[PDB]
Design a protein around this motif. Structure first.
Motif, mmCIF file in Angstrom:
data_model
loop_
_atom_site.group_PDB
_atom_site.id
_atom_site.type_symbol
_atom_site.label_atom_id
_atom_site.label_comp_id
_atom_site.label_asym_id
_atom_site.label_seq_id
_atom_site.Cartn_x
_atom_site.Cartn_y
_atom_site.Cartn_z
ATOM 1 N N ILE A 5 -9.008 9.917 -1.106
ATOM 2 C CA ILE A 5 -9.631 10.278 -2.126
ATOM 3 C C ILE A 5 -8.580 10.450 -3.547
ATOM 4 C CG2 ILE A 5 -11.347 11.559 -3.390
ATOM 5 C CD1 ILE A 5 -12.164 9.105 -2.049
ATOM 6 N N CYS B 215 0.749 -1.000 -0.060
ATOM 7 C CA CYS B 215 0.031 -0.291 -0.033
ATOM 8 C C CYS B 215 0.942 1.277 0.106
ATOM 9 C CB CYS B 215 -0.982 -0.080 1.235
ATOM 10 S SG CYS B 215 -1.329 -1.576 1.697
ATOM 11 N N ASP C 139 -2.935 1.123 -9.649
ATOM 12 C CA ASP C 139 -2.782 -0.251 -8.811
ATOM 13 C C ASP C 139 -1.827 0.183 -7.469
ATOM 14 O OD1 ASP C 139 -3.251 -1.470 -11.474
ATOM 15 O OD2 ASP C 139 -1.902 -0.404 -12.172
ATOM 16 N N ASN D 57 -6.556 0.803 2.870
ATOM 17 C CA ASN D 57 -7.228 1.865 2.893
ATOM 18 C C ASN D 57 -6.373 3.111 2.060
ATOM 19 O OD1 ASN D 57 -9.605 4.094 3.838
ATOM 20 N ND2 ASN D 57 -9.990 2.034 4.371
ATOM 21 N N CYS D 58 -7.152 3.765 1.163
ATOM 22 C CA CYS D 58 -6.398 4.770 0.426
ATOM 23 C C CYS D 58 -7.314 5.976 0.471
ATOM 24 C CB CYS D 58 -6.405 4.243 -1.141
ATOM 25 S SG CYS D 58 -4.907 3.098 -1.264
ATOM 26 N N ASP E 58 -4.787 10.530 -8.737
ATOM 27 C CA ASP E 58 -5.588 10.989 -9.752
ATOM 28 C C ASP E 58 -6.280 12.319 -9.282
ATOM 29 O OD1 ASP E 58 -7.342 10.694 -12.394
ATOM 30 O OD2 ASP E 58 -8.653 10.795 -10.782
ATOM 31 N N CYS F 134 -2.786 2.213 -5.412
ATOM 32 C CA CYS F 134 -2.957 3.797 -5.072
ATOM 33 C C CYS F 134 -1.744 4.442 -5.404
ATOM 34 C CB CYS F 134 -3.366 4.035 -3.710
ATOM 35 S SG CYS F 134 -4.765 2.865 -3.083
ATOM 36 N N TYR G 39 -6.614 8.794 -5.273
ATOM 37 C CA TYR G 39 -5.739 7.714 -5.641
ATOM 38 C C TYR G 39 -6.514 6.428 -6.028
ATOM 39 C CZ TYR G 39 -1.941 10.716 -3.658
ATOM 40 O OH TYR G 39 -1.194 11.743 -3.163
ATOM 41 N N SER G 40 -6.150 5.993 -7.066
ATOM 42 C CA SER G 40 -6.777 4.594 -7.545
ATOM 43 C C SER G 40 -5.852 3.648 -8.231
ATOM 44 C CB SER G 40 -7.851 5.042 -8.396
ATOM 45 O OG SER G 40 -7.707 6.231 -9.339
#
Length: 49
Positions: A35, A14, A40, A32-33, A46, A42, A37-38
């Protein structure tokens, strides 16, 4: 009677605020990431400004 905690051989899987969270229910390992980041793991950011 203890909390072994997440493993330390994945090599900081992570990224960007990656808090390891072991779910007893699902019986799996998730992170848990935040908002924005998405990508692979995170990895990619983005941010919408």
């Amino acid at each position: 009677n203890s909390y072994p905690g997440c493993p330390s051989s994945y090599d900081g899987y992570c990224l960007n605020g990656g808090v390891c969270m072991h779910i007893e229910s699902l019986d799996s390992y998730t992170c848990n990431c935040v908002i924005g980041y998405s990508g692979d793991r995170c990895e990619h950011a983005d941010l919408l400004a």
